[PDB]
Amino acid sequence: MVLYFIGLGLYDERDITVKGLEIAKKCDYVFAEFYTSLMAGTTLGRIQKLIGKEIRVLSREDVELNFENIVLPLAKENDVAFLTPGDPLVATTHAELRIRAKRAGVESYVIHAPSIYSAVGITGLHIYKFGKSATVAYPEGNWFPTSYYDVIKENAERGLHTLLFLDIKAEKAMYMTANEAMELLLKVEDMKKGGVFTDDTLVVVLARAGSLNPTIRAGYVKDLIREDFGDPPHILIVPGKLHIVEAEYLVEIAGAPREILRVNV
Amino acid sequence: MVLYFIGLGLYDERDITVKGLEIAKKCDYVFAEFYTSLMAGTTLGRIQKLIGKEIRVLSREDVELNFENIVLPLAKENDVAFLTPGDPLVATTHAELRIRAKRAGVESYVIHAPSIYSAVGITGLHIYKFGKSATVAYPEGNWFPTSYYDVIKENAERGLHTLLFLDIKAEKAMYMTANEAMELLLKVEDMKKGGVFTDDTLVVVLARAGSLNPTIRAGYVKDLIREDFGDPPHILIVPGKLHIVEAEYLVEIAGAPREILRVNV
Numbered sequence: 001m002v003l004y005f006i007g008l009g010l011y012d013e014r015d016i017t018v019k020g021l022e023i024a025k026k027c028d029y030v031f032a033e034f035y036t037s038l039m040a041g042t043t044l045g046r047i048q049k050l051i052g053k054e055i056r057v058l059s060r061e062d063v064e065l066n067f068e069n070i071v072l073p074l075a076k077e078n079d080v081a082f083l084t085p086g087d088p089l090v091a092t093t094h095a096e097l098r099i100r101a102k103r104a105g106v107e108s109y110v111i112h113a114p115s116i117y118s119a120v121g122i123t124g125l126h127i128y129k130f131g132k133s134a135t136v137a138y139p140e141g142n143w144f145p146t147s148y149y150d151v152i153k154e155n156a157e158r159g160l161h162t163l164l165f166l167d168i169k170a171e172k173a174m175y176m177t178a179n180e181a182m183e184l185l186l187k188v189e190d191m192k193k194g195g196v197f198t199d200d201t202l203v204v205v206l207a208r209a210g211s212l213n214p215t216i217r218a219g220y221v222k223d224l225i226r227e228d229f230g231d232p233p234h235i236l237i238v239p240g241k242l243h244i245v246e247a248e249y250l251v252e253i254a255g256a257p258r259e260i261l262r263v264n265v
Numbered sequence: 266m267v268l269y270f271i272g273l274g275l276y277d278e279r280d281i282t283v284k285g286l287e288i289a290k291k292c293d294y295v296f297a298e299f300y301t302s303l304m305a306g307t308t309l310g311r312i313q314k315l316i317g318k319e320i321r322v323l324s325r326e327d328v329e330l331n332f333e334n335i336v337l338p339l340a341k342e343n344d345v346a347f348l349t350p351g352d353p354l355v356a357t358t359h360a361e362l363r364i365r366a367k368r369a370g371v372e373s374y375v376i377h378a379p380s381i382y383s384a385v386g387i388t389g390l391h392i393y394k395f396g397k398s399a400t401v402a403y404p405e406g407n408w409f410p411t412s413y414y415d416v417i418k419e420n421a422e423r424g425l426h427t428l429l430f431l432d433i434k435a436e437k438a439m440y441m442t443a444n445e446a447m448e449l450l451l452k453v454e455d456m457k458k459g460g461v462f463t464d465d466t467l468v469v470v471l472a473r474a475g476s477l478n479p480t481i482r483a484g485y486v487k488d489l490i491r492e493d494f495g496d497p498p499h500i501l502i503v504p505g506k507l508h509i510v511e512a513e514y515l516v517e518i519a520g521a522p523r524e525i526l527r528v529n530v
């Protein structure tokens with residue numbers, strides 16, 4: 001009669017909370033989805049070994065089209081867990097799954113875990129200064145989406161930071177790198193000429209948040225566009241004007257050039 | 266010979282990540298602060314029991330003025346952990362403590378935990394639609410903070426949601442309720458008269474996120490301003506223009522007036 005939405009956290013199998021682990025261990029059935037994102041620092045086998053339960057993976061179609069006939073039926077007479085990378089319901093489509101549960105007469109509870117949304121606090125950028133977020137999508141065929149560029153423009157003009165999620169082909173385990181994202185933004189800039197993203201733009205790259213050894217780098221596009229930030233996943237941030245404390249953290253912790261203390265504050 | 270900043274999560278001792286627990290258990294010294302937020306579902310005793318170590322609680326003064334005299338000295342010859350509610354670097358100034366660690370020759374690591382900043386996803390509002398955040402602070406003497414009002418205005422004009430952290434005076438055991446925040450906002454409205462926050466404004470309240478049964482309520486200020494949302498901590502959200510699915514969730518899960526389903530596109 002109960003369905004638990006449980007977050008797996010940021011990077012590996014230990015990023016789930018103690019609460020989520022203990023609840024998952026007591027569930028009769030455990031499902032999981034790895035299409036909204038992946039857990040790059042672990043494997044399905046390691047997660048399964050930690051929880052001590054067989055884990056049934058669901059595709060985007062299984063969930064979006066058949067959640068009510070795959071998961072809910074079992075939840076009607078058993079304790080069922082639905083694991084998701086990060087924090088449950090951060091992904092935009094997951095919230096409605098609670099409505100499906102309600103419709104089916106199934107109780108649902110959410111067990112939170114760290115999300116990249118809050119983990120960006122490790123960049124030293126003040127969380128309250130982040131504005132609207134966006135996702136950088138790979139262009140394809142005759143389609144060249146650029147809404148993420150407009151998001152940066154609108155945030156930056158108001159002195160806010162912009163968190164940019166990078167494209168991912170979960171099923172193929174293919175990640176867009178911060179380097180590719182910078183190249184794309186420069187390309188969009190050459191097209192719109194809004195003066196939003198250039199070689200002189202200060203950016204921050206956060207790779208493998210959640211790991212004990214994440215890569216945190218800050219600097220100008222001209223210098224970082226060909227830098228190796230390590231293995232995925234990568235997150236790109238275009239900060240707005242910086243509070244001196246933010247700049248000092250970027251210099252001392254993220255290796256940013258001293259120049260940001262006079263140019264970006 | 267290391268310093269760990271470890272988050273404890275949203276509500277109780279089990280909101281810590283498995284990673285954070287296993288590391289904290291092996292540290293030589295464990296310090297913590299409980300003034301940046303309120304963990305309403307646990308006690309120092311229960312946390313100490315889970316980690317199996319004595320926890321030295323520090324005051325805001327101990328940290329801000331003497332972190333390098335109380336904590337860092339030990340981290341030079343031992344493994345030390347500094348625990349905090351939620352995520353250690355979200356809506357705190359703890360990021361700067363990493364600079365103090367460096368300058369003192371101490372390597373530091375960050376272990377994330379569930380944060381209210383991303384937990385608001387449970388309200389059904391799209392996380393990417395949240396704009397700049399703000400804090401509603403208690404007026405003191407002749408000083409009456411009002412900056413949070415302008416934040417709501419700025420976000421709303423862009424169709425973005427506004428997350429409002431509520432004030433906390435840990436030493437006085439005072440935790441601002443969503444009710445007190447709404448009252449303060451109505452007073453600022455009468456002053457600036459910008460039509461930003463009125464009795465007809467739709468708001469969302471999330472209380473005790475992290476618990477299994479948090480209070481999630483949506484409705485007009487005139488109806489919610491005197492409603493009992495249970496014990497603290499509370500967070501207040503002022504949504505911007507709603508997507509249909511957001512409205513459906515607010516109605517189905519947060520008990521909002523069904524009239525909001527009729528979005529004015």
Ligand SMILES: Nc1ncnc2c1ncn2[C@@H]1O[C@H](CSCC[C@H](N)C(=O)O)[C@@H](O)[C@H]1O
Nearest residue numbers: 275351352355356380381431473474499500
């Ligand atoms: N479990 C919870 N439920 C509702 N609001 C919460 C909360 N935890 C924190 N808050 C909100 O955030 C304020 C403290 S701000 C510090 C936040 C913390 N670092 C984190 O990551 O969550 C509180 O006064 C309250 O308004």
